[model samples]
Target: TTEIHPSCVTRQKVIGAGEFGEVYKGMLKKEVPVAIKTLKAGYTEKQRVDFLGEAGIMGQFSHHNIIRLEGVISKYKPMMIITEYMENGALDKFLREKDGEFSVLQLVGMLRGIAAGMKYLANMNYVHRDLAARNILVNSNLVCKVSDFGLIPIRWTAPEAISYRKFTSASDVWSFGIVMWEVMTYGERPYWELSNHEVMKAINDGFRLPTPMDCPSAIYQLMMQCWQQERARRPKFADIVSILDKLIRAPDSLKTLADFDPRVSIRL
Candidate 1:
């Protein structure tokens, strides 16, 4: 299980707050940087199970596009879990800072990697319940890896999943569509500040987010397909990989309409 001793963990720095507790950037063996997920004191048994459950689930994933689990420190108090450190942090903030810096082709490549990761999870019968740009991590090489399976933002969850509290790979695809919109808009807020109830009603009424200012029509079509109301109608992660592969093969096919002017904060 790769359990790490508490003393061997050093160079701790609070990176950010995670769902269960604080997230820190720490060095293991005084050398390797790793993400330390702390489950602070006073945590309930349910919380502990949920926290460790994610680690156990992640232990089996060894794909490049998925964040790697280093080990855990559950034997001591203030239980800690460890993961490979991501240099660039979350995908949303990375894209926000570099807004318009990437071309459509580059963005497609990121999405393709994410799809490949999700395909691995789907193949193993793991439903990520939460899949969004914020839940994705980016490294020094601009590689995007899926992260944060245990924490789900109410805004990022699928309609059916939220309503019935049921989750499946199909529901994950619905969140993938939302992530697609977030990427296309360069990290713009989803639903544009609508209330949770309002957003729910709109989605129930068959409304989907409009394509970003310069999103290619082809990519937008795939986003719409992922938002199919019937869960069974949504494409599987494997199918998504195929679609992205085709697009990656013919980058020229991602052409934009003449009237579509891409407004952005920075140069493209």
Candidate 2:
């Protein structure tokens, strides 16, 4: 594990507040810009350890689309968790900041990056529990990196996770479906302002989100497949990566979803 000495950290400004503590935009050794997550004052030992847990998980990953945990400051009070600073911040917010400026290929490229990261995690047998656009960090280059872990919001969780407190790769795939919807809508809230309770009830009642206006149908179908009631039927992350790879290879293919049709023998 990478341990960042407390002295190297220079606090800049608070970027976010959370139950654990505040997330700050800071500098490491006055050279590298970084994101610093700190434990709230008087935090319990358990909270400090859990905060570091995210670091441990990130340290295991070595993928371009997975946010790197630069290091941690666990030996001192107000322990710090440092990660690479994402210039553009969260994917959803970044999309809004651009205001429909990104091309369809650019959006597809973002999805490919996310899928590549997720594929790596799946191969390592890690379930992200929370996988959504909001958890995805975007750099200035528009490269999307999967972020946030350990604790997840109720809205992005899967039905099985909500009812049984179960989490697996299948559930992560389910959450990715919601993420796809979020991206397609260019940061619109899923379920059209429905409460978490209503979302759960609607999902349990066999309701899936309608395709976003002008969304490429193949991508929409993949979102639908991710929502399959039977978890086993959901495509693996590797499959997702492969499909996205195919899409990137043939930009014109996004015009139709037929290439992704399982009914046809040809597939990505």
Candidate 3:
């Protein structure tokens, strides 16, 4: 049932590139707009298998805040992984382009959606090895959904995960903190100039990202909680959703911006 017939999909212009191949803005059954990721020709057996595995994982998930997997065309050449189209595209680019356009509460709502999605994954016992603004997709209505699950960027990864290859929901929480910083800063790169090596070193040395300018104090506090060195100390995704809900319900709670000192914070 997860297999999609080639006759049902019509590939369109390339929209982006992925680790495995090019991604296209396409159509399914000549009706539904979709995003299709094609496994480039000459792929090795291992690469092909990994690509299909990712599609399989996406197909199993069902949550409003998680990207919807449309189906896959794996029975023939040019294997493709298809997903529902997001009009606004990747959250990182979307936030940068729409910077200063959304209210603080609106931004919080986006974060809440992400947390809700992560909570669902946590409940399902799935660890999203990669969680970041770049992996999140935004739609026309400003709804953000967690996507691009098969990945990681060192800056957004947890310390234990980097060193020991230990991944868990707690590690995902750590990445969520980085994602919060990204969203608050309008998609600024985490650690700005720090290399992946530098980021790993700094985090092990008790360094956490400083609060983004204009980020709510309450939200920054939650971000800090996520960066706790010990995985056990990180707040669960469910708790994060509840915290965001409370802040959203009481708008005044988000008025105070986290104190920002450029000298202490890494910057461009």
Candidate 4:
């Protein structure tokens, strides 16, 4: 049994910080280890409400691959959101920490975790615009979970036409494509040194990312399918779930899922 220890609460440390908030180590009443993050204060009314709104969205979500939001603070110095602390933290940093020492099972586990989270977001008509490795938290077991709802805007349509504020299932898929690329390339920088306008232009001009062999074709093909400029043509989250489920159940079937193209080379 993974006993929640009293010692877990005896000491505290600031383990992480980001645009959304700062995270601290703490212990739950049950003695289970927990992470406590404070939603930064001093924002305008809209920003405060937006922060609460993101917390609400994260709180209601329950999935193995989604970061579990325990609760939030009210009338407090720093409004806090509690969750399971991923000891290893972000996937990219975790892999790099080992000098890229990760196995196939580990890799597949990470992807499945993201796929599972995507399934949840898609079902709720929410698309995570920021679906990169950094947003995907990894635990001691190397199991990854999607985090950071602050970047997700809820009740907004996953657009047929994208703008800065709009999110679409296809756009979420685009983020997934980016995440998949990150995994296959052993956590190399995504779009390193490329200007935002340049990436947007390249994407619009049929400049697709190259397929790394380590990434199974089926999933890669599905990623390309999701990246289609025409949002309507992209696969749905339900469809993504089924594809990933197949991969999980039948590892040998990876060949069937391949959609590789060596011709595409991204120069950044």
Q: What C-alpha RMSD separates each model from the true structure?
A: 3.5, 6.0, 3.1, 5.7
Q: Of the pair 2 and 3, which is ahead by TM-score?
A: 3
Stretches > 4 Å off in candidate 3: 18-20, 40-42, 149-152, 262-268
Name the candidate that leads on lDDT. Answer: 3
The TM-scores of all predictions, comma-separated, are 0.90, 0.89, 0.91, 0.79
lDDT of 2 by residue, 160-260 (tens): 88899889988898888888878877888888789888988998999988877567878888888989888899988888889989987998878764233
Sorted by TM-score (best first), the order is 3, 1, 2, 4
Give me the overall lDDT of model 1.
Answer: 0.85
* Candidate with more favorable, higher lDDT: 2 or 3: 3
**CA deviation > 4 Å runs, candidate 1:** 18-21, 149-154, 256-268
Query: Residues 1-268, candidate 4, lDDT per residue (tens digit)?
Result: 1223332333278776745567788876656677876667675688678767777887778888888876666456466666777778887777667755765546766777788788888888776776777788887777779886334321112233334555666778767766777786777765555665666666667776667656677767876676777777877767877887778688776644344556568889
Of 2 and 4, the candidate ranking higher by lDDT: 2
- Candidates in order have lDDT scores of 0.85, 0.83, 0.90, 0.68
* lDDT for each residue of candidate 1 in 1-268, tens digit (9 for 90 to 100): 4788898886378888866678889888848889998999888899899888877887888999999988888899778888889889899999899989998888888999999999999899988888999889999888999987344466677878988988999999988988988888889989888998888898899888877867878788888889888888999999999998898899888885323444455656
Q: What value does the lDDT take at residue 132 in candidate 1? A: 93
| Superposition TM-score, candidate 1 onto the true structure | 0.90
- Estimate the TM-score for candidate 4: 0.79
Q: Give every collision pair in model 1.
A: none
